[PDB]
Amino acid sequence: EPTLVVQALKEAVKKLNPQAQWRNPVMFIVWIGSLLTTCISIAMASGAMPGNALFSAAISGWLWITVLFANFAEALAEGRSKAQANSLKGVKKTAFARKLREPKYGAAADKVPADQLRKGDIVLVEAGDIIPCDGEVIEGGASVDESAITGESAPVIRESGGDFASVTGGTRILSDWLVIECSVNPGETFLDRMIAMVEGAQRRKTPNEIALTILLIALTIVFLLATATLWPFSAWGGNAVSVTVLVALLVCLIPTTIGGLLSAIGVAGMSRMLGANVIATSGRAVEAAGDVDVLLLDKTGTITLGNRQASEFIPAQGVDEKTLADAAQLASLADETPEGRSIVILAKQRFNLRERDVQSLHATFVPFTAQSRMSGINIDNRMIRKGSVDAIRRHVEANGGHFPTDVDQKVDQVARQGATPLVVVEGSRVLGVIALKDIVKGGIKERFAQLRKMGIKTVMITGDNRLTAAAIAAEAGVDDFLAEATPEAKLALIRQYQAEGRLVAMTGDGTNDAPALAQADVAVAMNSGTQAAKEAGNMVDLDSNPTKLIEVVHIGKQMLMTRGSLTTFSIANDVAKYFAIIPAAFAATYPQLNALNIMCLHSPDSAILSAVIFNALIIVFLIPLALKGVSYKPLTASAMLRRNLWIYGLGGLLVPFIGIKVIDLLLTVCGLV
Amino acid sequence: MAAQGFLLIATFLLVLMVLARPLGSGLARLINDIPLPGTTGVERVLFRALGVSDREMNWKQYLCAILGLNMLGLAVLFFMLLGQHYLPLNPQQLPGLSWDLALNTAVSFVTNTNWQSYSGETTLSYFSQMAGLTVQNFLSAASGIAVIFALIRAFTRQSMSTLGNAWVDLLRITLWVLVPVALLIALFFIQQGALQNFLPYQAVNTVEGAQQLLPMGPVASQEAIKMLGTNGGGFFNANSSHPFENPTALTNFVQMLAIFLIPTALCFAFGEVMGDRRQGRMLLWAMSVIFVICVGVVMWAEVQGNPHLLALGTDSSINMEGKESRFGVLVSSLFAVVTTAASCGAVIAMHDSFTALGGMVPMWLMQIGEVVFGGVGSGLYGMMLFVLLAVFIAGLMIGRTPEYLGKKIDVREMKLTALAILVTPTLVLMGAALAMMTDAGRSAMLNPGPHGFSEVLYAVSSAANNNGSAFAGLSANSPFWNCLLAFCMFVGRFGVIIPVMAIAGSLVSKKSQAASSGTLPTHGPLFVGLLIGTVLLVGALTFIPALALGPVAEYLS
Amino acid sequence: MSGLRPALSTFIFLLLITGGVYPLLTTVLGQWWFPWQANGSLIREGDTVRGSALIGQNFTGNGYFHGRPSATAEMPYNPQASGGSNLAVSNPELDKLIAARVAALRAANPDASASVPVELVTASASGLDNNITPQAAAWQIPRVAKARNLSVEQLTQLIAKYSQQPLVKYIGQPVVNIVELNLALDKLDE
Amino acid sequence: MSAGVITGVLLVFLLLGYLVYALINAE
Ligand SMILES: CCCCCCCCCCCCCCCCCC(=O)OC[C@H](COP(=O)([O-])OCC(O)COP(=O)([O-])OC[C@@H](COC(=O)CCCCCCCCCCCCCCCCC)OC(=O)CCCCCCCCCCCCCCCCC)OC(=O)CCCCCCCCCCCCCCCCC
Ligand SMILES: CCCCCCCCCCCCCCCCCC(=O)OC[C@H](COP(=O)([O-])OCC(O)COP(=O)([O-])OC[C@@H](COC(=O)CCCCCCCCCCCCCCCCC)OC(=O)CCCCCCCCCCCCCCCCC)OC(=O)CCCCCCCCCCCCCCCCC
Ligand SMILES: [K+]
Ligand SMILES: [K+]
Ligand SMILES: [K+]
Ligand SMILES: [K+]
Ligand SMILES: [K+]
Ligand SMILES: [K+]
Ligand SMILES: [K+]
Ligand SMILES: [K+]
Ligand SMILES: [K+]
């Protein structure tokens, strides 16, 4: 909780407008009770009604603090989202654009800010200037630092080739001029869509949150009825219970923990989804991704799914580590595969490899091909192709070069280590081998076994033959594998998996597998221009990782079970709330009821203040759990229910006793009451 | 003492399950629209004569049918009670009832509550007892069993837009499950000492020379339908304490078996018709655990009675006040728990004379919603609402969409379940509040201290939760009391029936999935304990302050 | 229109079938199989009735057996108002009534034990209670024997004759029919 | 009754009506 964010969010909180409060019925009831207790306190201070006129004031102040804490939760979640929003948008608020009239560079560069310019224009960007437009490229070439999307700062080639000519967002260029024709208008710009997403928080509630609010409202109704009927019941026996005690019991009984933390949970979970390089338009799709029973992972362009990434560089006899990393960075520069992205990221992390001056090289770049499983460039007359070891062995044996030496025991060593060997070549001489290690610390096999223990099934689709698909399936640990994939075959697979009443979540290409993505219940689209994807739906994956649907399952089950755990906690606290307030509330109506005070508290007003203070402070103490979700252990459904009960139901039955006791002890030592 | 009570609980439970499992199979056959053996051939002729073609109807038509028949019963009973002196079978030539008592009795006997604000033997005639009370005891029970039949059918049927036939359901229930079993029970009651005559009130020359006017009548048949249909509307002032009503301990045992017979058989029928008996055994395990704990607590509280009896020179402190002598204190306690758990107004013992702790647990156990072996079908769909809450909470815990037995639970089901669970506690709370803010409600009082508020709260809970068991010290013959309790009975039964019917009509439109490893099972000790915790925790969160101002304050006093 | 036909048809059929046939069949079966059980179990002695074998009578006589208290309207043992004492446990009115009954029974039975049985001082649920425990009957033996000039052994034999234990011990309690016992006592003495 | 009692009862009824309306709605 950094101060420069928390203070500004508290400043946003301080507007306690009733219009912003009545959308949440639980804390609108709490707000109404707070205003009622405040008015009672002012009337008692003026002289309208007798009594303490300070106990009521303290109760009203702490109820106002409860309302402010719920608003602190909601605005803290909104500010945590808006920090990541302004980490990308804030550069483009104060910038400039270089306009042009013709695609030729040899023209007068017109100076227009172009912050509201329509589509179909022509602009220019050069020498580290921020790209202000989102369109296509007809000519030019430069290295582009996609920090605003990737978050790892890695150069990509943006040249007119057919697929590598699509800029996105306010993204930093690094080499030289690159003419751009923006094909969108503001509002459908990527940064504008992220603005609409971060300002689109809790505009439409998900069905899970709607049903949870229905249950919370029903609990609010029964608690309100009991509290309101206590005055006629206790007015007959002795003097009536004071109204401020009734309002304190009402607020302290109503579930205000989950009631104030629900929107915080939703916004923080969607912020966590945004931090996982996933563009989700609505949270209903995220909840469905948490709700599915089978997972389909389309491997057609990537290599060994997406868990395997670059770990370390193994050189050769006739090359140096710096030269090997230079060749690998130049080869994988023109690769949007997660493997090539990992190669670029590892090279940057090792030797700080940067801008390469692609236009001075004058090399035409060939991207990754699904059938060839190859990716390389055309510098001068040599090929810097790289890929799988069998494919590159076929490539080097297709020419007159001699077969490489010691690479067999090198790839044997990395296979004994347990990594996929990625090999680069200069055209005739093998320049080394790269070990692709799994990025999951616990292991992708253990993660898939945990998914199996969760009851959710994992299936991957491979475009290669039966042997490669079986090998990758045995290496990963999946349940079913497919070979020779066609869109008709995958649509039929989705239909026959849905035929047994199961929900299908499938990730794949948004441009090649769009009907099957629409057929699937959840669609984590990847490798797209993202414009029509976000228009149609089709939850956009940024770094095109096929295994991030597991990450959505994590962030899309964690939110739901955090909601359930906090709901059960807020329900279960009320037993200790009874044991604290009921003897305090009925101290004068029935003095025999002091035997129910099982905890040795001092005075009834001290008990009421202690219970109200704990009810206020539990929201602050559960801020980190609501922001981070729950660190949950993937097991069977019965085991998860048992663990969640043993943690949160027993917490709700135990820790309010301890908290009320220690708050009353602190009050008695400090002498306020 | 403790061994005798445990033996009584165990014997009653095992005999109940043994006698109720074949009735569970019979109710399963009625649910699956399969005619009973020996009934077809004349059932078709009866439906052809009655103009029912067994046409399937949806939830709107089905609920409208049941509600219209209930209004017809209410109107017929109200006119019969107003004009009972014109009707025959008047041994004492009793006058017609007042408007408030007639309306309260009509609403009470149509809403399967059977609250009595009067003395039967000096209020109602033989024709009134024979027709307007027994017919309503059949019809309200048949309506409840029909509602739970349609709910079980909604849980079975996959993507259909209809539920069943209301007239076929009520006719089958009344003619096959109700009339023969109540006939056997009434024949056993006449085997014991119970009235099934129509003689006038026989004057008795007492041995010491006093005068006794014995109230003869057709008592045994009304007893049998009262016990079988979980009704509780007695012939006399004492709903089951009268020796013309319960002459023997065997008769009392048959009474408790007949009370718990149809909820147990309906749980067994649910378990059989779902295909998996584990859900019915889950419901039975939860209700049996709560019931055993409640009987143990009430038996201990009645054994550890008042110390005033020991102080004023008696050989034992057992609270025998307000209890019959032919049945023990343990039997009276067990019947009190049975009748306050299963929505039955019949009482062996006067519940005012119970200890505060032994009268709290009947009160709380009927305030939770009357769901532990409750009503006749009524407690089973009360369990359905509570297990909908339980499966929603458990689905939230496991991170998946809630799903009870294949069908997912959505916003509309959540709204209707929340409303149905809201309906009866709000009636209890505002009815008791309105009774405590009016001198008309505070003038009918009998006992002082917190026991008086206990009496008021118990009466309002009896009206709203369709029990009819009364703290008999409260004088509910006031017009304000009659109107308030009648409103509570009406809104309670019909505003629980309507939203659970909308729940059934929402559930028929859904298709059940396949039970995967990721789906939470709805059986086992974990889910039984979760459902028990849900029911007791909701009942506590609704009624701990009221019980603290009433029976808890009395017990600590 | 469409719904007024089957609703009315089903209602009239079920009303007639239940309300007519079920009590009529139950009544004819009762009067055919168990007479003097469906008719009230009235003890008939020479063209008059002396009470049922189930209801119970007010016995304030010194030579009779005193049953449980009744507390019914307009009369102690009033079958026209078969209610019960609904006084609470914490009721001082019930406390003073119990104390008065204890004092009255201690005055009436001096030769018996000082601690009276619970049944003889606590009112029943229905005031028409014909039953007391055999321990209460044994408590009442000495006063009846002294009043009627009889023996404790004969009174014990008569009580055990009119003691009706249930079929199973733990579904009820053994009880003594007070009205039949007093009638047999008067028939044996005179 | 009294002014405070009747305004408390009416405020409870308006809060109950607002909560029932919120339960009926999905926002
Ligand atoms: C204090 C004791 C607490 C326990 C009491 C006993 C509870 C049952 C014991 C179960 C444990 C042993 C069984 C092993 C498997 C366990 C897993 C399981 O799911 O068991 C299900 C178990 C059997 O199911 P299953 O074997 O898995 O299914 C096999 C068939 O495919 C399914 O079809 P089916 O089962 O209908 O067909 C078989 C059936 C054919 O059905 C019939 O024709 C009629 C029989 C059905 C009713 C059986 C009697 C049920 C009586 C229950 C109440 C007993 C008194 C308890 C009073 C407690 C008072 C404190 O014939 C049988 O074989 C019956 C099972 C025999 C086991 C019970 C032995 C009977 C003696 C009576 C109980 C004595 C104690 C047992 C030992 C416990 C340890 C002390 O349930 C039953 O016994 C009968 C099913 C219907 C009744 C279930 C409702 C239970 C109500 C609980 C009341 C207890 C009070 C609550 C405790 C309160 C504490 C605070
Ligand atoms: C505060 C939260 C506390 C959470 C407690 C969680 C306890 C976990 C213990 C950890 C050890 C487990 C490790 C082994 C797991 C597998 C073992 C197994 O077979 O199943 C045992 C079971 C696994 O669950 P499952 O998936 O359903 O079983 C699969 C079987 O195939 C299907 O079961 P089955 O029928 O086939 O089993 C056959 C046999 C197998 O026997 C075994 O092998 C058992 C092995 C473990 C020994 C421990 C005994 C467990 C069963 C006894 C439970 C009664 C005592 C409960 C003690 C709780 C603390 C342990 O069991 C029997 O002999 C009779 C079973 C007949 C079923 C009827 C059960 C009697 C009703 C009792 C209900 C619960 C007590 C009332 C609670 C009332 C509180 C309000 O784990 C349990 O221990 C269940 C106990 C849960 C107690 C309920 C906690 C209630 C707390 C308040 C409610 C909170 C509501 C809050 C809601 C707020 C919003 C509204
Ligand atoms: K609720
Ligand atoms: K709370
Ligand atoms: K009832
Ligand atoms: K009654
Ligand atoms: K309820
Ligand atoms: K109910
Ligand atoms: K009910
Ligand atoms: K009900
Ligand atoms: K409730």
Numbering used by the authors:
A (entry chain B): 10 to 682
B (entry chain A): 1 to 557
C (entry chain C): 1 to 190
D (entry chain D): 1 to 27
Provide the authors' own sentences about this structure as they appear in the paper.
KdpFABC is a high-affinity prokaryotic K+ uptake system that forms a functional chimera between a channel-like subunit (KdpA) and a P-type ATPase (KdpB). The heterotetrametric KdpFABC complex comprises four subunits, namely the channel-like KdpA, a member of the superfamily of K+ transporters (SKT), the P-type ATPase KdpB, the lipid-like stabilizer KdpF, and KdpC, whose function is still unknown. At high K+ levels, KdpFABC needs to be inhibited to prevent excessive K+ accumulation to the point of toxicity.
The structure was resolved at an overall resolution of 3.4 Å and derived from ~14% of the initial particle set. Strikingly, the N domain is closely associated with the A domain, thereby disrupting the nucleotide-binding site between the N and P domains. Closer inspection of the nucleotide-binding site shows that the catalytic aspartate KdpBD307 is phosphorylated, but not located in proximity to the TGES162 loop of the A domain. This indicates that the state is adopted after the canonical E1P state, which, in a normal, non-inhibited catalytic cycle, would transition into an E2P state. Due to its compact organization, we termed this state E1P tight. By contrast, the D307KTG loop is largely uncoiled in the E1P tight state, with the phosphorylated KdpBD307 pointing in the opposite direction, releasing this electrostatic strain. This orientation is further stabilized by a salt bridge formed with KdpBK499. We suggest that this state represents the biochemically described E1P inhibited state, and is adopted after ADP release from the high-energy E1P state, when KdpFABC attempts to relax into the E2P state (transition 4b).
